[PDB]
Design a protein around this ligand. Sequence first.
Ligand SMILES: C[C@H](CCC(=O)O)[C@H]1CC[C@H]2[C@@H]3CC[C@@H]4C[C@H](O)CC[C@]4(C)[C@H]3C[C@H](O)[C@]12C
Ligand SMILES: C[C@H](CCC(=O)O)[C@H]1CC[C@H]2[C@@H]3CC[C@@H]4C[C@H](O)CC[C@]4(C)[C@H]3C[C@H](O)[C@]12C
Length: 159
Amino acid sequence: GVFNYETETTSVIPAARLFKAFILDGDNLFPKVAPQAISSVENIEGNGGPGTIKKISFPEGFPFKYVKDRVDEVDHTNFKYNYSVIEGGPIGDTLEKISNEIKIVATPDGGSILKISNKYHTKGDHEVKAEQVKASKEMGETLLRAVESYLLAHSDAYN
Ligand SMILES: C[C@H](CCC(=O)O)[C@H]1CC[C@H]2[C@@H]3CC[C@@H]4C[C@H](O)CC[C@]4(C)[C@H]3C[C@H](O)[C@]12C
Ligand SMILES: C[C@H](CCC(=O)O)[C@H]1CC[C@H]2[C@@H]3CC[C@@H]4C[C@H](O)CC[C@]4(C)[C@H]3C[C@H](O)[C@]12C
């Protein structure tokens, strides 16, 4: 079955620029700006569109070594990015896939809001609790804040 978790978080970076950096150049940015969260991003197959597969590796001592994701949809107009975690780490005999959706919306102060849906697809039993899903949220926030800091300091990047 499916467990759905939704959250929102704010950014001080305008939506289009954040989308260009965090989404469209994340493979480069994350290992650069948050190497103690993501050690590397490997493009396995594809050009970035639907079906593209990447391997996201984590630093030594993290609970999981890597995951592979597959890009599901990229909406450059509405700043939407959907992808699925389809192998590695927690994926196996209890968890079949994690389907995620990110949407970035502009706020009038010149910042943005990220609207996130995480859907865990399990094989029958058992359960995915909010407390454990906190690790997803924490990692996501760490990556966002690292990218934000870079974009604040490098004003010529991703305009
Ligand atoms: C933001 C990129 C997409 C852009 C890109 O591939 O460069 C996506 C692609 C894969 C994503 C990761 C997949 C595994 C994790 C899923 C969790 O539920 C949230 C944290 C992690 C660590 C995700 C963080 C982030 O949401 C990533 C890194
Ligand atoms: C808590 C869920 C669900 C686990 C289950 O019940 O099967 C699992 C599934 C995907 C897991 C994430 C995969 C990517 C990351 C791997 C890191 O090495 C530790 C942080 C992250 C962000 C993990 C945190 C957490 O361990 C998650 C979010």
